[PDB]
Design a protein around this ligand. Structure first.
Ligand SMILES: Nc1ncnc2c1ncn2[C@@H]1O[C@H](COP(=O)(O)OP(=O)(O)O)[C@@H](O)[C@H]1O
Lengths: 714, 370
């Protein structure tokens, strides 16, 4: 009735009543159809004796009784009776087979990339969601965006959109379609403007990851602004913490940010000659640690796209050649070589060719650079005194310099873009579009993975807090007396030992300052402080055949193992203020514009943690709205998803967390009339006074609440 | 909350915040009081000046150090200096910062007990701790093994440490330092005609010592050279004109560190006490001690002291060991740097002496447990 106005798209958004009513009467049994594990599917239906094309007999408290066919295509699994892994898995499988790539999950919004053009977005014939709520329309994200509009207008409070992004595609198209929706509602457009200069971010904050080929190594938080009354204004984007350790160190079979290789494509010899640089990548260490090139992409077209982006931006000749000079100088850093002074402990240079290159490039002096690197100076009270240096300390200084150069250049380009997309009258309200990397579980986890997992941990605890308070509100609404330990914070507050200034990263910096500290000493200290005294901290199970881990933590995404080899090199950032002063005077005006505005302790962990807390404060002042994109298959074919890949994804996507938490309901909350009609075989006081446990329900204001595992009997 | 590091020393207060690269406040540990009359009514004359304010009104004041040989011998003056350090130089409130004080080894217990009592009662620090200057110097040098020779203004001491273990039976403490060299220079300058007797003139002579004095690699032929030519003579200009020129005094002043018989002391030179402290250690660690002689403090800042030290110890030790004198270019603040590193460690935050432990145990808490 209310769906036929979507026409050809109604079949996708919500099927007609006929197939659904014939699907609500399927003959299925609760005691002859369960779910058992598997080697290729990991989860299969069966008939302890079990057969579905393969026979096994297993324990009777590991099977999952399949869901009732009353609910076998509902788009919101928050109403099922048997909430378990294969239930949700095959539910999504089925709703994706009979094409409906959209799904509600409690509070999330799970969508799947269809790999197929669908008119489910265009034209406005489907974008007619105007005015509606989420609960009544078919489960489209445009309804979510409309709800965000209604909320921001009716409370004058900022809103937030958090999508999972490490999926290669589905992130892009979903961002595009939602921002197009926002352009439409509160109406060379701002979307054109956004996607014009996006190659900047693509070339600076993206690199080939072992399980990807274009991964955003930073957070994109688009602020799309609205008028005081609700007409769209200009939109300023905000960037955050960046995996800047990538600047120097790269693992095997990976590489740092594209721009190096884009330039190195030997496309425009003017650059490669202005930077006095060859084309062999194996001559510059900061990029040649892993792989020098991936055959899944060409670099010439990337260089040309980036040139076009610089042109459409307000960059001049200097605002382009200077950035090229900065990148070239960072690369010429990679092969600066120093030796101990003969018979004594002091770094001495051997060959200054790269020093000449860098001094010419940045607008600096070669001798001044060399000495200020070899002779740091401090402000002691009201005096100046030089400091001696071992070679490794100077190498630390060089790496920190390169990192800071790259980071501030990145931030300045961010501000430049935010300016170039800004011309508008005074505004008040906006919607937050938070793009972020997701959880990582690779076969060899390292420090950067610990950082990203901690970020995602904070974000997941944040979401859990949100869903906790909304559920508590709903329970107060129906007079439903039920109180519980905060699901939002306490279950995860114990897995953030990493932040407590005695935990993992704290002890990490402690060792960074501790003399002669080794990874073995670090492991010793870790085991002293946490082995046995923590339940989440456990020893890894290193069985010969895999790379060795050194400790294991139980996150929400399973139990993760890490290998601590090389982490002191990852975290140390002793910044050399002398060369900072050198920068603040350079003739290369871009350098001065970067570093315009009574040190030896800076750790990547510290800055990472503080930026994370900054983003958390940025969020906690607003109201969130979540999105969960999924890549169904790796062969990119439409129609079928490979279940182990998608299952691992959904595990790390965190929706299973929402399922586990609503299991602590009463996730099933029904009215009186529906249950009175559907189960009258013999007002609800008499109907459930007939029969089970009386805590299975909580009668209040024409609402019945059910724990999972009750409607499999009805 | 951040903590304060307050390396006192007998000649220079160096304070700052735990976590910085260098001390924020470095001023003389001195208290001056006016001698003369005072005639201008309404000038608003203070009762006493501390720090480098007493160094600019130097001409009319009489200066006194409240620390003689690492020992605080005037507790009211030390209280004045701490009050200054907290409220006027650092500009903080001591009630909100744990304080890390520092002290030389082998000095009376009442010194530490009074430090603790003063801090907790008349400054209400939340916690405090009293480290050893040599350990912090080793922290700052970035190693866990070596025999550190600290030589400040009042006291010179060796502390041999191996793998983080101190050898307290081999600690050797000597009581000639910068101030005894300043006095010997004041006395040795009279044979050219210059007469410095005032305390202000003692400060002048200290500046002469810091600017013109060096250690001679070979004392005897250096003496003969200075006697032959006049290429070693330099000139210094007092703060009223009146240039003075000194010859062999330049290297005769710090030579006292290697021949303490010049000032009538019976001890051995710093090279020989270093060697003795080494030879008092277990035969298996002294090869690694021979190669990690860490120098610290201001009195180890003379030009050519590392070369003379290495020559002397090499002449003493067996001819197979590798003698390495480690002399950083900033060794004058090694104690403070190491103290900030220490007070910044996460594993150290349980080593503080909380106010409650003091309230339970008395001032004797300090050495009895920490
Ligand atoms: N450049 C220098 N050359 C020689 N002696 C110095 C130099 N600088 C300081 N001193 C001596 O060092 C002493 C102060 O050193 P310091 O390490 O601050 O002692 P403390 O730690 O006891 O305050 C002064 O007495 C001064 O004579």
């Amino acid at each position: 009735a209310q769906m036929a106005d979507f026409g050809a798209a109604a079949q996708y958004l919500r099927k007609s009543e006929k197939e659904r009513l014939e699907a609500q009467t399927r003959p299925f049994d609760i005691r002859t159809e369960c779910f058992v594990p598997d080697d290729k599917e990991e989860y299969v239906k069966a008939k302890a004796e079990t057969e579905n094309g393969k026979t096994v007999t297993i324990k009777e408290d590991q099977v999952m009784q399949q869901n009732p066919p009353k609910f076998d295509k509902i788009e919101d699994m928050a109403m099922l009776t048997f909430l378990h892994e294969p239930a949700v898995l095959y539910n999504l499988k089925e709703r994706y087979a009979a094409w409906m790539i959209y799904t509600y999950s409690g509070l999330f919004c799970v969508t799947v990339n269809p790999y197929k053009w669908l008119p489910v977005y265009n034209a406005e014939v489907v974008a007619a969601y105007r005015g509606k709520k989420r609960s009544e329309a078919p489960p489209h994200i445009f309804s979510i965006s409309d709800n965000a509009y209604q909320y921001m207008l009716t409370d004058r409070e900022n809103q937030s959109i958090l999508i999972t992004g490490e999926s290669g595609a589905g992130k892009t198209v979903n961002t595009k379609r939602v921002i197009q929706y926002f352009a439409s509602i509160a109406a060379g457009t701002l979307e054109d403007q956004i996607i014009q200069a996006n190659p900047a971010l693509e070339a600076f904050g993206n690199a080939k990851t072992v399980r990807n080929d274009n991964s955003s190594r930073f957070g994109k938080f688009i602020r799309i602004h609205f008028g005081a009354t609700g007409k769209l204004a200009s939109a300023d984007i905000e960037t955050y913490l960046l995996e800047k350790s990538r600047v120097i160190f790269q693992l095997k079979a990976e590489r740092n940010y594209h721009i190096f290789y884009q330039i190195l494509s030997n496309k425009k010899p003017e650059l490669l000659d202005m930077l006095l640089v060859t084309n062999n990548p194996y001559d510059y260490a900061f990029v040649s640690q892993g792989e020098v090139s991936v055959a899944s992409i060409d670099d010439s077209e990337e260089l040309l796209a980036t040139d076009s982006a610089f042109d459409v931006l307000s960059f001049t000749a200097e605002e382009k050649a200077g950035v090229y000079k900065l990148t070239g100088a960072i690369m010429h850093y990679g092969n600066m070589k120093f030796k101990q002074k003969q018979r004594e402990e002091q770094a001495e240079p051997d060959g200054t060719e790269d020093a000449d290159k860098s001094a010419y490039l940045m607008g600096l002096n070669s001798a001044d650079l060399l000495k200020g690197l070899c002779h740091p100076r401090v402000k002691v009270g009201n005096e100046y005194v030089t400091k001696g240096q071992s070679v490794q300390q100077v190498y630390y200084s060089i790496g920190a310099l390169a990192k800071s150069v790259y980071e501030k250049m990145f931030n300045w380009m961010v501000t430049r873009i935010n300016a170039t997309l800004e011309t508008k009258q005074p505004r008040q309200y906006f919607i937050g579009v938070l793009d972020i990397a997701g959880f990582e579980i690779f076969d060899f986890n390292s420090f950067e993975q610990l950082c990203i997992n901690f970020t995602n941990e904070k974000l997941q605890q944040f979401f859990n807090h949100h869903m906790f308070v909304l559920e508590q509100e709903e329970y107060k609404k129906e007079g439903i007396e039920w109180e519980f330990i905060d699901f939002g914070m306490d279950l995860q507050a114990c897995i953030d030992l990493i932040e407590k200034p005695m935990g993992i990263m704290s002890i990490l910096e402690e060792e960074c300052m501790f003399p002669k500290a080794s990874d073995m000493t670090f492991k010793a200290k870790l085991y002293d402080n946490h082995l046995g005294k923590s339940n989440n901290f456990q020893k890894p199970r290193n069985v010969k055949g895999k790379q060795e881990a050194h400790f294991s933590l139980v996150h929400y995404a399973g139990t993760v193992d890490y290998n601590i080899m090389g982490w002191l090199e990852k975290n140390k950032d002793p910044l050399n203020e002398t060369v900072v002063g050198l920068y603040q005077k350079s003739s290369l005006k871009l350098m001065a514009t970067l570093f315009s505005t009574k040190s030896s302790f800076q750790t990547v962990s510290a800055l990472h943690r503080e930026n994370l807390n900054k983003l958390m404060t940025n969020l906690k002042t607003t109201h969130p709205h979540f999105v969960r994109c999924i890549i169904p298959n790796e062969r990119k074919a439409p129609g079928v998803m490979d279940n182990p890949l998608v299952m691992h994804q959904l595990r790390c996507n965190g929706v299973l967390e929402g399922i586990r938490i609503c299991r602590k309901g009463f996730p099933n909350r029904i009215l009186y009339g529906d249950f009175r009609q559907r189960y009258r075989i013999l007002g609800a006081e008499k109907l459930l006074g007939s029969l089970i446990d009386h805590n299975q329900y909580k009668f209040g204001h024409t609402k019945v609440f059910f724990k999972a595992g009750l409607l499999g009997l009805l | 909350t951040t903590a304060l590091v307050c390396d006192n020393g007998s000649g220079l207060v160096k304070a700052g915040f735990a976590g910085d690269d260098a001390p924020r406040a470095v001023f003389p540990s001195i208290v001056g009081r006016p001698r003369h009359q005072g005639v201008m009514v309404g000038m608003g004359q203070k009762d006493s000046y501390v720090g480098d304010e007493a160094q600019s009104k130097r001409g009319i004041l009489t200066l006194k150090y409240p620390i003689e040989h690492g020992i605080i011998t005037n507790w009211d003056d030390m209280e004045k200096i701490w009050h200054h350090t907290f409220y006027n130089e650092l500009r903080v409130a001591p009630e909100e910062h744990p304080t890390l004080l520092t002290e030389a080894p082998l000095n009376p217990k009442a010194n530490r007990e009074k430090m603790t009592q003063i801090m907790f009662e008349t400054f209400n620090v939340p916690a405090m701790y009293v480290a050893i200057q040599a350990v912090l110097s080793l922290y700052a040098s970035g190693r866990t093994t070596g025999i550190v020779l600290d030589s400040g203004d009042g006291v010179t001491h060796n502390v041999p440490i191996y793998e983080g273990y101190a050898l307290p039976h081999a600690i050797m403490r000597l009581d000639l330092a910068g101030r005894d060299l300043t006095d010997y220079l004041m006395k040795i300058l009279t044979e050219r005609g210059y007469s410095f007797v005032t305390t202000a003139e003692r400060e002048i002579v200290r500046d002469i010592k810091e600017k013109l004095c060096y250690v001679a690699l070979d004392f005897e032929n250096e003496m003969a050279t200075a006697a032959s030519s006049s290429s070693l003579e330099k000139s210094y200009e007092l703060p009223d004109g009146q240039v003075i020129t000194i010859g062999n005094e330049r290297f005769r002043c710090p030579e006292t560190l290697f021949q303490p018989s010049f000032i009538g002391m019976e001890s051995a030179g710093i090279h020989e006490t270093t060697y003795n402290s080494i030879m008092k250690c277990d035969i298996d660690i002294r090869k690694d001690l021979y190669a990690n002689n860490v120098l610290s403090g201001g009195t180890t800042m003379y030009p050519g002291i590392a070369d003379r030290m290495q020559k002397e110890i090499t002449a003493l030790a067996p001819s197979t060991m590798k003698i390495k004198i480690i002399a950083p270019p900033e060794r004058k603040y090694s104690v403070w740097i190491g103290g900030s590193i220490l007070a910044s460690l996460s594993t150290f935050q349980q080593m503080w002496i909380s106010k409650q432990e003091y309230d339970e145990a008395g001032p004797s808490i300090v050495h009895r447990k920490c």
